Design a protein around this nucleic acid. Structure first.
Ligand SMILES: Nc1ccn([C@H]2CC[C@@H](COP(=O)(O)OP(=O)(O)OP(=O)(O)O)O2)c(=O)n1
Ligand SMILES: [Mg+2]
Ligand SMILES: [Mg+2]
Ligand SMILES: [Mg+2]
Lengths: 106, 698
DNA sequence: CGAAAACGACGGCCAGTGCCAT
DNA sequence: TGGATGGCACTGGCCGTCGTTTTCG
């Protein structure tokens, strides 16, 4: 696996202070759309290796981060580019829609 | 006899203008309408009926029309108007007596849809007239173009108002006649619409007289109101609010927030097959959104310039699960249950709908490994209690602070005959559900209700409070009824020392109050488990107490036995209830009225609660009358003033201690009088307390 | 400019739970 | 087979009114 599995306590330095693009996936095990985009993320992690980092944050195990971003739906993909949220799209996009989401923001 | 009703610009407290009125005279079989300028003529007519020793019929006139006419006659015509009690009949009072088993909308204050059972037709219409009229007015106000504001419907008189005013009377007349046709209250050989007032009262079931007196007296009490210490409760709210903030801080810190599905319209379907998966939260497949926006330039339209990126968020086709962020709410039993189970708690008590029970009792026994969470439980219990006090004192829709009036008093409402048994009901707010002095914050709550908070209109001195409560009422009621079985043993023994304290010692209970809860729970067939719960033990300690006490007064069984034979013919037992065949579905109350019995297992309670309720009702009545025949005046401009009636207790404000001592002594004479009045087999008594407020007087 | 759409603060209604008093 | 008689708070589901925001025809 080349995807970073975050925690509320590690989020700040793994994300907000990482240098280089980072795509964070706020998910939950009880969400269908979440279990859908997952496989795609694993692939997007290798395909864009070197261009950005793919990290997942389980909002159940880590309830403190999501609130700071007003997550209203999941899976939420927040694209970080130096402590700042670059792009933000919600929903189980397809392997195509996602790559088109990144490329346009990378 | 005449039937009447009026239309004015506001409820009693704020009314300042008589719009119109109507009078139907049985002696002329004709209706007469009175408009704004006919006010004086209206009063004349009513007073003419009194001059002939006649009767005036109003629907809710006792609480509204009559006192209102007195108020408007003075303000508008600078005239003294005072219809004597004995000349007034109230069909709402009669209706509540004869159809005690039924509910009413308290004249439109309650919502019919939220009331269980059926509602008498005529009375339903009368109670909806103010609302139907508003609808009819709010309509004609749209046909013409104007807009609607607050309650403008009552600001000015109009002939639409007059029409309702007339129909009220035609409807009140029908209700009156329907009620009079009940042979149980009015002997059929008499035309009660063609008799003088003294005849109407004396030829009718005693109950009719009692109820009208109670209503007259209680409407007065409402007008008096209960002197309330707004400032004190205001500072208590400040104390309680701070304490709630601190606990919420600790609790939200101990139990972290979390997310939940919310707003999912569509259903999630399996990607492999297509099989709908109901179990999964509902989803939302958007159809508005993309990477970039539609081209805006000649360059973008051609691909020479990247289109504007879409800051939307979603992407048409990409399904997502909408969710809400919830923060731990100590007032939500759903939250407490969720957090506690996630800490190892295993419920052993659920509800009909499968929900795990979460009251103080179970919380008291919950045990989890984590020390912090275990301690959080004590904070949750405190929070609930604190909240309960805030709910009742400041925040609820019926909170004391939302009802204190200009005159620094709370004018709670009373339905003199709102319960089947003959007890009254109280609301807006319910001054009969004020925290007990010994419960958390009880003293502060109770102390805020008191004569001391009212300053004499002339001297400016604080009034004194007189509190009187019937001693072991329902138990003495039992003694009366089982006297024919034990020849008055219990009726005699109940008088050897205080009955509750004595029982307390015998049952080894901690407080007198707990002996009261025990004994009555016992007397009314509480099961072994419940008795355990009341005394803080188990089913065995309950079965013990049941025998130990039933063994002493075995006659209780005999009484229970006879009530059963008189009411029930036969009964079965199905799956969702008991199917009963009745001989008679009611009990004859002390004043002769019919007292509906809802269930065989509650018959005894119906018998004893009704007896207590009617005894007390006659009591407060005879008491005020004795005070008055003693030369005392009822009012803040007088000597004393009824502030509250809580079943078998009264709280009277007095101008001086001396007056309070007389009120207390008089109430006692009155109680004994009532007991003699109905040849009661058990001596009746009362206890009186002089003091500054409710905390010291009860 | 209005329409289609994603929203949330919001009030009336109601069922379920449980606390206030007597 | 059962404590009873009441008022009322507060959550949470359902439902519909309504002022605000966004990208598009
Ligand atoms: N848990 C209770 C408490 C009271 N009551 C009834 C029966 C008595 C009546 C009035 O209550 P109290 O004034 O407490 O009655 P009491 O026994 O006369 O009390 P005391 O002798 O202490 O005044 O209400 C009841 O049914 N259930
Ligand atoms: Mg009226
Ligand atoms: Mg008592
Ligand atoms: Mg009492």
């Amino acid at each position: 696996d080349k995807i970073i599995h975050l925690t509320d306590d590690s989020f700040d330095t793994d994300v907000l202070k990482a240098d280089g693009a980072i795509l964070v996936d706020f998910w939950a095990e009880w969400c269908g759309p979440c279990k859908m985009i997952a496989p795609i993320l694993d692939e997007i992690a290798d395909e864009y290796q070197g261009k950005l980092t793919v990290a997942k944050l389980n909002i159940d195990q880590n309830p403190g981060t999501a609130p700071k971003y007003g997550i209203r739906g999941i899976p939420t993909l927040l694209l970080f580019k130096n402590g700042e949220v670059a792009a933000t799209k919600v929903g189980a996009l397809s392997k195509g829609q996602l790559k088109e989401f990144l490329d346009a923001n990378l | 006899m005449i039937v009447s009703d009026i239309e004015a610009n506001a409820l009693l407290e704020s009314v300042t203008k008589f719009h119109c009125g109507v009078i139907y005279d049985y002696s002329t079989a004709e209706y007469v309408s009175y408009r704004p300028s006919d006010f004086g003529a209206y009063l004349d007519a009513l007073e003419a009926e009194v001059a002939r020793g006649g009767l005036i019929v109003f629907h809710n006139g006792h609480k509204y029309d009559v006192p209102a006419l007195t108020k408007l006659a003075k303000l508008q015509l600078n005239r003294e108007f005072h219809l004597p009690r004995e000349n007034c009949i109230d069909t709402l009072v009669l209706s509540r007596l004869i159809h005690s088993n039924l509910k009413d909308t308290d004249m439109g204050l309650l919502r019919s849809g939220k009331l269980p059972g059926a509602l008498e037709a005529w009375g339903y219409r009368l109670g909806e007239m103010k609302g139907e009229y508003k609808d009819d007015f709010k309509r004609m106000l749209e046909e013409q173009g104007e807009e609607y504001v607050d309650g403008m419907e009552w600001w000015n008189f109009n002939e639409e108002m007059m029409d309702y005013n007339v129909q009220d009377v035609v409807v009140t007349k029908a209700l009156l006649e329907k009620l009079l046709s009940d042979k149980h209250y009015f002997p059929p050989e008499i035309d009660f619409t063609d008799v003088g007032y003294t005849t109407f009262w004396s030829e009718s079931l005693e109950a009719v007289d009692i109820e009208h007196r109670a209503a007259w007296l209680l409407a007065k009490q409402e007008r008096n109101g209960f002197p309330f210490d707004t400032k004190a409760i205001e500072e208590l709210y400040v104390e309680l609010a701070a304490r709630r903030s601190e606990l919420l801080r600790k609790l939200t810190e101990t139990f972290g927030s979390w997310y939940q599905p919310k707003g999912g319209t569509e259903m999630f379907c399996h990607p492999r097959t297509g099989k709908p998966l109901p179990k999964y939260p509902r989803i939302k497949t958007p159809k508005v959104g993309g990477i970039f926006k539609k081209p805006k330039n000649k360059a973008q339209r051609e691909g020479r310039e990247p289109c504007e990126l879409d800051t939307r968020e979603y992407v048409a086709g990409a399904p997502y699960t909408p969710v809400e962020h919830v923060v731990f709410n100590p007032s939500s039993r759903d939250h407490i249950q969720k957090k506690l189970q996630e800490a190892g708690w295993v419920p052993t008590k659920y509800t009909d709908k499968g929900a795990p029970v979460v009251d103080d009792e179970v919380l008291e026994g919950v045990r989890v490994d984590d020390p912090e969470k275990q301690a959080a439980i004590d904070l949750i219990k405190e929070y609930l209690m604190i909240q309960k006090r805030i709910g009742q004192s400041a925040e609820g829709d019926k909170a004391w602070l939302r009802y204190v009036a200009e005159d620094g008093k709370i004018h709670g409402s009373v339905n003199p005959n709102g319960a089947v048994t003959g007890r009254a009901t109280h609301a807006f707010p319910n001054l009969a559900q004020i925290p007990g002095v010994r419960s958390p914050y009880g003293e502060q709550c109770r102390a805020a209700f008191g004569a001391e908070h009212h300053l004499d209109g002339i001297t400016g001195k604080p009034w004194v409070q007189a509190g009187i409560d019937a001693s072991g009422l329902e138990l003495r009621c039992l003694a009366h009824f089982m006297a024919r079985f034990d020849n008055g043993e219990y009726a005699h023994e109940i008088l050897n020392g205080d009955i509750h304290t004595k029982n307390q010692i015998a049952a080894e209970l901690p407080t007198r109050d707990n002996a009261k809860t025990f004994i009555y729970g016992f007397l009314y067939g509480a099961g072994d488990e419940k008795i355990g719960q009341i005394v803080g033990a188990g089913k065995e300690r309950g079965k013990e107490l049941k025998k130990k006490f039933l063994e002493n007064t075995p006659a209780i069984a005999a009484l229970r036995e006879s009530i059963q034979q008189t009411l029930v013919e036969s009964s079965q037992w199905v799956a969702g209830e008991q199917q009963v065949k009745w001989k008679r579905r009611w009990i004859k109350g002390l004043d002769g009225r019919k007292v509906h019995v809802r269930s065989p297992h509650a018959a005894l309670n119906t018998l004893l609660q009704s007896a207590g309720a009617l005894i007390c009702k006659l009591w407060i009545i005879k008491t005020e009358e004795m005070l008055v025949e003693k030369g005392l005046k009822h009012g803040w401009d007088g000597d004393f003033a009824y502030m509250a009636w809580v079943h078998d207790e009264i709280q009277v404000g007095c101008r001086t201690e001396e007056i309070a001592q007389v009120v207390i002594e008089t109430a006692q004479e009155a109680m004994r009088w009532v007991g003699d009045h109905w040849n009661f087999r058990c001596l009746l008594d009362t206890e009186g307390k002089m003091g500054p407020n409710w905390a010291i007087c009860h």
